[PDB]
Amino acid sequence: WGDASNTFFNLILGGFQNLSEFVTLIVQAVTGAPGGLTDLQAFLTERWG
Amino acid sequence: WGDASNTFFNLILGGFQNLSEFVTLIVQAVTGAPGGLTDLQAFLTERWG
Amino acid sequence: PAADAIAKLIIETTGNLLGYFLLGGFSSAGTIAADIIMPFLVGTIAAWLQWKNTGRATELGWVHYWELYQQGAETNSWSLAALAALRGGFLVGRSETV
């Protein structure tokens, strides 16, 4: 079970515990302000405008 | 099993059903036109041009 | 069987272990588990019924035989009828006149 946990959380999930924090990481990588996917879309829309 | 399902589909996977749906959401957030990763690359490349 | 039936031991323990795993219990011991050790306690939780016959003790007195293990005609029915199983067990060692 410990080996399965290592495989699931390190290999399959990368270095991310879940998908929500990974979304936040994507938002922080493409935008200065941290936030959700809506925040990402808003910042990108402002940039394109 | 119900608690495990809640944890998997809400915590680990966020609010997204699957990675394909999450990819579509990322493409819709960063580009106006929905589509796959190829569509994201195409829109961003024409915007680069 | 109401505590450690094989269906319980498989399904419920697998679900509990999967929930613990998804929370990250095996990644780090911080998580609090919910009955992931049920197969380890097979035949130990509420597995017996002991009854002391007070009337028999009063009849017999200070010196008496203590206890007797009794197996029913149906080996998996005492949990269904505890009282009937106990009375069937007490059917054995009683005062007898012929």
Residue of B nearest to C11 (CA): B1
The CA dihedral of B28, B32, B35, B37, to the nearest 10 degrees, is -70
Cβ contacts below 8 Å, chain B against chain C, sum to: 19
CA C62 to CA A1: how far, in whole Å?
A: 57
Surface of C (41-70) touching B: CB under 8 A: none
The DSSP secondary structure of B1-45, one letter per residue, reads -HHHHHIIIIIITTT-S-HHHHHHHHHHHHSSS---HHHHHHHHH
**Beta carbons of A5 and C17 less than 8 Å apart:** no
C residues 16-35 lying closer than 8 A (beta carbon) to B: 18-19, 22-23, 34
**How many Å lie between the alpha carbon of A20 and the closest alpha carbon of chain C?**
15
Q: Report the distance separating Cα C18 and Cα B41, nearest Å.
A: 38
- Please give the Cα distance from C37 to C17 (Å, whole number): 9
Question: Determination method here?
Answer: cryo-EM
Which residues have CB under 8 Å from C67's CB, separation 6+? Answer: C50
Contacts of A among chains (3+ CB pairs under 8 A): B, C
Question: Within an 8 Å CB–CB cutoff, is residue B29 touching chain C?
Answer: no
Q: How far apart are CA C61 and CA C87, in angstroms?
A: 21
Question: What residues of B are in contact with residue C34 (Cβ under 8 Å)?
Answer: 3
Q: Which residues of C touch A9 (CB under 8 A)?
A: 24, 27
